[PDB]
Amino acid sequence: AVGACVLCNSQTSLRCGACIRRPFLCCKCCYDHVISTSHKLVLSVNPYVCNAPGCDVTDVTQLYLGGMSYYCKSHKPPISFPLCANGQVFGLYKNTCVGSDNVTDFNAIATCDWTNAGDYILANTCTERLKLFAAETLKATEETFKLSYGIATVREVLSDRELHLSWEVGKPRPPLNRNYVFTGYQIGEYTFEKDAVVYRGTTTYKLNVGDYFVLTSHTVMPLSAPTLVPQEHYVRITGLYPTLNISDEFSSNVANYQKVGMQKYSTLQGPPGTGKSHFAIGLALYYPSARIVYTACSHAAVDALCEKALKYLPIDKCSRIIPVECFDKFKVNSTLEQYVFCTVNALPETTADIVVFDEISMATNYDLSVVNARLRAKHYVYIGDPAQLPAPRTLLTKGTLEPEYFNSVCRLMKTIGPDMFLGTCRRCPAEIVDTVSALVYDNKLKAHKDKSAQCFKMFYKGVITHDVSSAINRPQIGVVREFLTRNPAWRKAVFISPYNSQNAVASKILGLPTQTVDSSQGSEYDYVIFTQTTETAHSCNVNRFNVAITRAKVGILCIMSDRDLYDKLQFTSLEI
Ligand SMILES: Nc1ncnc2c1ncn2[C@@H]1O[C@H](COP(=O)(O)OP(=O)(O)O)[C@@H](O)[C@H]1O
Ligand SMILES: Nc1ncnc2c1ncn2[C@@H]1O[C@H](COP(=O)(O)OP(=O)(O)O)[C@@H](O)[C@H]1O
Ligand SMILES: [Zn+2]
Ligand SMILES: [Zn+2]
Ligand SMILES: [Zn+2]
């Protein structure tokens, strides 16, 4: 009942009872909260409510201190004082209170519903203490909203991978994609996709009629550590001990490795195929005695760091921390190993000489705080690319979230700039590099490869159907099918689109492996076939387009719906 104010850290006995997270607010910050918002319930050792029998007055602006108890205007004794007075709510430490000038930010964070991009902008431009309050409050809203969806019950099972579902009436249905993971009843986690639904479970299980699936609402724990520790700059490499000689394969990074050792935290922007994993593992080779924790939000990102480490680091010194199918070539759950590879959600409480946090565009401020709370490190290295994709914000429906508001690290990379930048793309044909360099990298990304002369574009609007909110463009797929008959080397291509439903139709008609742009991030393929499917904000987002066309190592075919993006592609145009 006694804590530190969320705005100014002053000691207080007050909490807002209307906020979902019930933050501490000092006497001065609490007044500015209740006097400007619909939040009028204040909590202390005892709740600020009228204590007379039968009275239901809970609005603190209508309550008075009489004796040691609280009463409304109709019940208060003659010798009383208002709880709200002199810009201050009565509590404890009323004289120590310092107040704050950012209460208008607090009030917006505390009262918003997280459906507007402007809510996320404020959550990333406020003070550090407010960033934590916003992250906790958003996550709580996301989890509680997951209870509003209807339950799905198995009516009949058609095969080992398809079934028919019944949906609870009166409640809305969750989208059927690989992002919405359901818990079965605990028969394990299940995902569904599109009559019949295709189902996928972590384990094979005999699914009976009546079994049900629900979205799993995770409880939300309070944050304590900042999203970024306060920065420090050192006069020399601190806590690290460089090798005498490093293999020339990594020598081009030595100046950046020295910079890592000379400040508390460092940021590295690495465009697609510029060597982010190579950099991260080279760090271990340059500081061979350093204990390094490699982390990221997704198992796929951790696994990729593992694959690189397997080639360059001693296998006996590595461990993959596993609470799905993860990398299996290291010892599992050996927390004490020199090199530990772990997703953020599974991090143990440990110390390290260096923490490497990869795929930073996909992190939220909640993730950044958890990493700092769990990992006490001498140095922190944030690796990623604000021109790539962010974590989905399930509640956001109004407005687009720009990269400078993805999280605290992306914000720094977009305002003051990254500490380090890998400027040579080694993966893609020059036609692609030149396109994305101008599109999102201010022309600073260089191509190592030549033009491939296997990069093609076609403008074809087609016909857009929809399966709920997922779009399908069958004519665009028909164009691809005709292209394949004439370009047989592309039978090994991967089909990519912004929409799951389009991928499902392409899979059936074309037979190629398919991937959504978002799922493709971090992967590379020789040949890519991309169908824009529609012209929407989703399908024209430059970050998403950047990711889509930089998957290719040799050739890409883009079937485009949007004239502006089509014209930017520095590809040979095809006719048909
Ligand atoms: N890999 C190493 N090579 C050489 N000297 C080391 C190494 N690791 C630690 N030391 C020495 O031992 C001291 C104690 O190590 P430690 O407690 O980790 O301090 P620090 O955080 O400064 O490395 C260091 O200050 C340094 O003088
Ligand atoms: N500075 C460098 N010196 C030598 N080889 C490099 C360098 N940077 C990258 N490479 C090579 O090119 C590859 C680029 O691919 P990758 O590291 O997966 O890029 P990213 O992780 O940024 O997608 C590296 O794995 C490595 O094989
Ligand atoms: Zn409140
Ligand atoms: Zn305060
Ligand atoms: Zn009363």
From Swiss-Prot:
Its annotated function is as follows:
Plays a role in viral RNA synthesis. Multi-functional protein with a zinc-binding domain in N-terminus displaying RNA and DNA duplex-unwinding activities with 5' to 3' polarity. Activity of helicase is dependent on magnesium. Binds to host TBK1 and inhibits TBK1 phosphorylation; the interaction with TBK1 decreases IRF3 phosphorylation, which leads to reduced IFN-beta production.
Q: What is this protein called?
A: Helicase nsp13
Residues given in the record as a ribonucleoside 5'-triphosphate binding sites: G270, P271, P272, G273, T274, G275, K276, S277
Q: Which positions are annotated as binding Zn(2+) 13?
A: C50, C55, C72, H75
The impact of changing P403S is: In strain: Mu/B.1.621
Recorded superkingdom: Viruses
Question: Which positions does the entry assign to LRR repeats?
Answer: 216-236
Q: Where in the cell is it found?
A: Host endoplasmic reticulum-Golgi intermediate compartment
Instruction: Report residues binding Zn(2+) 12.
Output: C16, C19, H33, H39
Annotated positions binding Zn(2+) 11 = C5, C8, C26, C29
